[PDB]
Structure 1
Amino acid sequence: ELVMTQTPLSLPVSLGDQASISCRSSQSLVHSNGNTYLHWYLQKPGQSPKFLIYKVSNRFSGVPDRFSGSGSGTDFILKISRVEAEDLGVYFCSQSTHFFPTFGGGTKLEIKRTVAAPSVFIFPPSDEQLKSGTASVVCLLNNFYPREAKVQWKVDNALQSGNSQESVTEQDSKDSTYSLSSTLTLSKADYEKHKVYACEVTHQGLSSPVTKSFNRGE
């Protein structure tokens, strides 16, 4: 069967620069009938793939001219000259010259942009949840770059470990930033043992860690 190999797995690239994704089949993709059936798709996060390039070098309808396919035989390139924020996603090549059609492993294209500080918001647990018997405290870091961020929780000024979770969005398709939530989950009983609830953020954008807090019953 037909291995297709994409490189790189992840391609970091700056706005306005050129991105090159390479794709390489175990055997030649030229059909006995003259044609090379190598295609490119793009999948943005949560979304179904979108048809991008067909037969090596032809853009599909509605596809920006800045996308460009090339190569022959066993090796192919997709070029995204002058990159835009909305170009973010996973790029797949696909051969259908030989039965059965295959897809390469995909290349995730990441944008690089200037550092950008988070906005931090804290959320007490609600009454409705408190009366359901648990307490979740939510800390939100909105629109930041780069991704890596240190979020510590402090409860009455004691450092917490291993009782919170983080979730991170995909890079935003307009401004390429990330957002993150840290959630402290406690039982309503542990919760009422303390008054102060604080999340302290450390990030490349901020010159000093930012702390966002509240005392219970506010």
Structure 2
Amino acid sequence: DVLMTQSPLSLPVSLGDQASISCRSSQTIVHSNGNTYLEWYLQKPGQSPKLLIYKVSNRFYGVPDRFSGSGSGTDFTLKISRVEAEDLGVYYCFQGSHVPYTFGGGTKLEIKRADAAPTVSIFPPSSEQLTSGGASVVCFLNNFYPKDINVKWKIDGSERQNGVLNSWTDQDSKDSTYSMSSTLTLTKDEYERHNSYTCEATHKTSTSPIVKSFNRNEC
């Protein structure tokens, strides 16, 4: 199979600026018939992908002239000349030249904004859940930028990896920030055997982590 290597994975831009997305193929994708079936697709959240560019450089019906595809051989480029709000989403290259046909890994086109630290909130398990024999500790990390963040859980000073589930929102349409939930699920027995619970967020905005914690005995 022809591997399509698409970079960058993520591409922050301000509205009005130009975006450039690269697609490299592991071999040439010129067909025997002389055509190069290199296609660019845009997929928005909850929608089917839509064709923008076909045969390397031809705009599909309805596609604005701000979208321009170029390249040849093994190196291809999509340029969006003055990025608008309707252009945000994930871009994929596709080769239809040699079976099996293959997609690039995608490029998320997103809004560049000022770096913002997360607002971190930690929640002990509710009395209602505890009554049921479960114990979930929830941490929200809200309205931060950029999206890159690392969250560590510590229980009595020791990092926990088992039973942590993370979920991330898409970039917010209003303020262009990202949010995240991190949830540690334990048995009630496990929960009651430890004292200190900490959600620790390391983000670009501070060299020191944001540390939110509670002590079970202080509840």
Q: Compute the TM-score of the two structures, normalised by the length of structure 1.
A: 0.71
Retained in 2: the 8 A contact 1:38–1:93? yes
C-alpha displacement of 1:187: 1.9
Aligned to 1:167: 166
CA deviation vs aligned residue, 1:71-124 (integer Å, no higher than 9, x gap): 35664321122335664544322233x463623423423544321121222233
Aligned to 1:114: 114
Call closer, same or farther: CA 1:56–1:154 in 2, change over 3 Å.
closer
Call closer, same or farther: CA 1:110–1:51 in 2, change over 3 Å.
closer
How far apart, in 1, do the equivalents of 2:29 and 2:152 lie? 53
Aligned to 1:54: 54
C-alpha displacement of 1:132: 2.6
Number of aligned residue pairs: 213
AA partner of residue 212 (structure 2): T
Q: Which runs of 4+ in 1 moved over 6 A?
A: none
Retained in 1: the 8 A contact 2:4–2:23? yes
2:159 alignment partner, SS class: coil
Counterparts in 2 of 1:1-218, with a 5 A limit?
A: 3=2, 5-16=4-15, 17-24=17-24, 26-27=27-28, 29=30, 32=33, 36-44=36-44, 48-72=48-72, 75-84=75-84, 87-96=87-96, 98=97, 100=99, 102-109=101-108, 111=110, 112-153=112-153, 158-162=156-160, 163=162, 165-169=164-168, 171-172=170-171, 174=173, 175-193=175-193, 197-205=197-205, 209=210, 211=212, 213=214
The gaps in structure 2 that reach 5 residues or longer are none
Pairwise CA RMSD of aligned residues?
Answer: 3.7
2:129 alignment partner, SS class: helix
Call closer, same or farther: CA 1:216–1:67 in 2, change over 3 Å.
farther
How far apart, in 2, do the equivalents of 1:151 and 1:73 lie? 42
AA partner of residue 102 (structure 1): Y
How far apart, in 2, do the equivalents of 1:72 and 1:43 lie? 24
C-alpha displacement of 1:9: 5.0
User: What's the % identity of the aligned pairs?
Assistant: 57
